[model samples]
Target: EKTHINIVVIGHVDSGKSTTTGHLIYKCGGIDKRTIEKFEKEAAEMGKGSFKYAWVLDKLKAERERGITIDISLWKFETTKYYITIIDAPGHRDFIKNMITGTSQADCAVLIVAAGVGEFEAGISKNGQTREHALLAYTLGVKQLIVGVNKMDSTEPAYSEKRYDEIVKEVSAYIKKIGYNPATVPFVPISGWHGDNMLEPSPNMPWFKGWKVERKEGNASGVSLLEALDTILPPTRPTDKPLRLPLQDVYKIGGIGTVPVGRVETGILRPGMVVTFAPVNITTEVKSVEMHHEALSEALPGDNVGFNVKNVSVKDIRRGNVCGDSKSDPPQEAAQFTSQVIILNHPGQISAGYSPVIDCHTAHIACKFAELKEKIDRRSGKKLEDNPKSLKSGDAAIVEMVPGKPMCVESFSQYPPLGRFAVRDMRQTVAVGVIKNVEKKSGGAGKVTKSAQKAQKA
Candidate 1:
């Protein structure tokens, strides 16, 4: 059997994710030059740049027309070390919430930062955005980040050993602050445009001692980025824990009443095992389970599978609904959750009654921070309460959130899938967070109070 790893490619837009992907597919022998030529001809007729290579991966017409990745895309390929399922995320600011969904399912990440001043400054100016991305990845416990310092050709006007070194220094400085070791998190300089040093060795920079890009997807003997990722990234499994699936989508097939699809977070789900959907906490036996379009009697953790619950409607089982063994009820969406949130580009301090669109799984709900807690520095992860009035860019803060509806949210450390959320307002993502704990509600029969209902309505 072959080992499989789930990896996500992320970084600033135009930083060469598509180009890097092109090189990977080409080097892996997934496509030939003849196909490339045909795409090139087609792209030319369409007046698109040599982006024909990218068009192969992006099949959506809306995406092609806009030239922006709006959702997560998947690609399957084999490396010398393992079978890889690469999840490509949109780097644009508008689609960051979608990026979070993709990253949530990944075990490792490849961060692409363009080499040189223009690309470097662009990434730095959006320092808040970058930090939010990195912090979210870190909070998810993704420790190994492979940094690809791309677009080395952009250094043309000031091309020199010193220029390359400066770009490396600047990019490295910010990355180190995010806790990635410069030595372990290797950076390879490459020109994605000319396809130099991406999948093959580059004669352009003899001064560069890094191995060729082709060396990435092998065993210990591998050379390129894909090889490196394949060799290092781990797989998922359920232990003694019971079954839990945070439903991402619920579908109805004429023959199979309601099918809920989600990544199994823990344990195995057998055909007859009883599972409970939270909030309502109704129990139902699993009639059947399927993975990769095949029926399976059982499924383990990390398996993105779908199962037909005995009796339920697409409406009864919504996204954000978590199905677990009856003993463990899924956490509820509450108005008071102590959470750590990284402020993206919010322009000003977050205050009371600040509402933003909250995204978790396929659920998008409007939520507000009913109270302010402590503010801290994102880089160091240290608390800084002196500035209580506001949390600027590059700052991390713990705030009490009052969500509009009850959501299935667990603690960041306990159940990550249910714990994390991305906040958007004005069509832009402003923050990402994880729950600490739910504040205890006051009074008798604190059972689903009006305040809770209003908070859910926020």
Candidate 2:
């Protein structure tokens, strides 16, 4: 048994995402030279630019011509010690939906940033690079990121190092300012084009002392950044100390009527246990457990598995619903919760009446801004307003989410996996948030009162 983890690679367009992914797959032996040779000749005959190896991974004709990744692609590899699933997502500002979809399935990420060209400069506005910054913030819990300062091969050595350091400092500062542990994350400098410090470390820079090697399957001791990243990239234990698995998708088997699939954020879920889905108030028994299509006797945290549920319809259970032990029930219908949000690229300010898609786990729902009580400067986390006109691109703020429809969300402090959510509008994810508070519904108290009265009558 190898420890299995899903990893996603994300970066801006022209940041060499395609090249990085192609190199990774090739270096890991997921693709072969003969395949590359075939594509090379065909691409040349067609008069396209030098056959980009990335096209082998991107697969779309438009992507090959444009020299950019517009969709998501996956590749898998294994070290003797662990199994890794890599998801490469588009970095263009416009294809954020693809980014969100790819990210939802990952337990960790590799955020590639161009060495210069002001990585975070373009998205910044009064709202604090809110979109990018918010994703970075949410990523802290959803992923243990290894920031790849890409394009190091470009001219201006000192300039590249400066850009790398600046980004590292900014990400570190923002995470801490928002109250997340920063020491756990790592940042590395690399040139995706030349393959320096990505799969392998380059001796080109004597100043760089980290080991440079590529992680190859069936070899556990191989020296590479990929191996180093695997050392501490596991799910964090949430304070709530409860088991919660947000149902991302539901399927059915002839014998097992419905199978609920999701990653276990915390606590253990064993077969024959009774669990309930929140907000909808439905309960079911776990008849069997399977991971990656293989039957498992039991499941634990960090295990992305499917539970063969008994007596539930696929329609009754949908994505975004949380399943947990029946006694504790999932948190749904929030009274209040504080969220650290970042606005990416929005045409105008994000204020009240702004109905954006809320992405938490595998769940995507439309939500309204209940209140924009306070706004903070993007660079500095200091409070600026009780109310603001609107949060523009590049700004980050602490805001409250009022879902148009009821849903389950855990407090960031309680269940970090259930705590983060994103706001999307116009087919683009504009902001991301991590829950700070979760107020119990008024019905909670009413239920307690009614139970007391019934006891007295009895």
Candidate 3:
């Protein structure tokens, strides 16, 4: 089975991040021509037909013809070695939290920066999402990045090699400050509107040398944007940890019965193994595992699988629910968790009794800042204060979270996927945190199936 991973688009809010991403997927055959034609005419009547390409992915509600990306839009396409899910993150001032706690975490980020003269400088400054996005993505465990210098077609003198070089130098310095190794990063000159350097090499810039392409007649042609994506190696899969697959969706196929689809975050999922759905604690036996319409005897981390489970009703489970092995390291509801949080953008100081939304993994739930435990220097772990009354921007504090819902999470040291979260308030992310400690619910763990009980003794 091909590796399945999620990639997110991030940069200046109007760097045409979506437009270029939409254009890439469009040319790569993610959307059919008939649908494109319909969107073209529908958008033309509204006098905004120039955004016809972006509408391919931003098909959510009024965002269709308005050219505004309000929330996260998801699109899926395939490359030679992987089936990729594109998390088209929006840069709306109000949707920063949505981008942070997207339905799925990102494996890689594509930084789309407009290469035009004035805008490139402004995009780097001006409270731009470029720096903010890079910061958040890095803190949230998105390590790899592919920088796409967009709007080459609109640059002064059009597709200027000098323009590409300047933008690259500037962006590399910025990301280097954010801790990304500039030596390993790839920057590709692209025009999302003209479809240049997306799937095929652009003839506009001869100075550009792409990855894995041959030189013909002493002239070297570069690789496309899609090819650059495949050059990054797949993330290492963890098979020793317990099974933790957060449901993207549950499918009810005619012959397949109840099929819960999700990417396996860790460990192996196999036939006849009993599974436990956390928070609700419904245990059932796996009948079979399938991916890309083919059957599987086992599914590992980074594998997105749709497996049939017997004796589990569709109503008992839904998206955002996590499934784990019934007997070994079964998932449990958290009574509370202690997290080291760095306040980043709260206009007002955060104090005790502060309650905001906490999004960890696929779960979004109300979490209370039950206590402000202590303030510390994040690097040296030196105690700054015994009990800080409040936390402000850039302050590192250990805070207690008493969730308002039955949420299951793990400590970052043990299970990284379920540990990190975003503190969202006032329609934006106010802080980001990693779980340092978690207390399991007392006598609140869900039921184990009889078959699981039978296998437990084995």
Q: How far is candidate 1 from the true structure (C-alpha RMSD, Å)?
A: 11.4
lDDT of 3 at 29: 78
Q: Please give the TM-score that candidate 1 achieves against the real structure.
A: 0.53
Residue 434 local lDDT, model 1: 72
Model 2 earns a TM-score of 0.54
**Candidates ranked by lDDT, best first?**
3, 1, 2
Encode model 1's per-residue lDDT on 98-148: one tens digit a residue: 333333256677777777666766765644234445555565556666666
In candidate 3 the C-alpha lDDT for residue 341 amounts to 77
lDDT of 2 by residue, 1-458 (tens): 77877665665455666677667666777556786677668777777556355654454323423245454333666654567766435433323333322333556667666665554554333333323533543534554555666676773664255666676777667655554445555667776667676566576654665523222222123234565556534454542466788887888777667887898887778886667676666656677899988888767788899988665678888888887875465445565566777677677767766777788887777777777866754432335776886778866666767776768888764676777687777678788766767775654421222322333354
Whole-model Cα lDDT of every candidate shown, in order: 0.63, 0.62, 0.74
lDDT top scorer? 3
What are the candidates' C-alpha RMSDs? Answer: 11.4, 10.0, 11.7
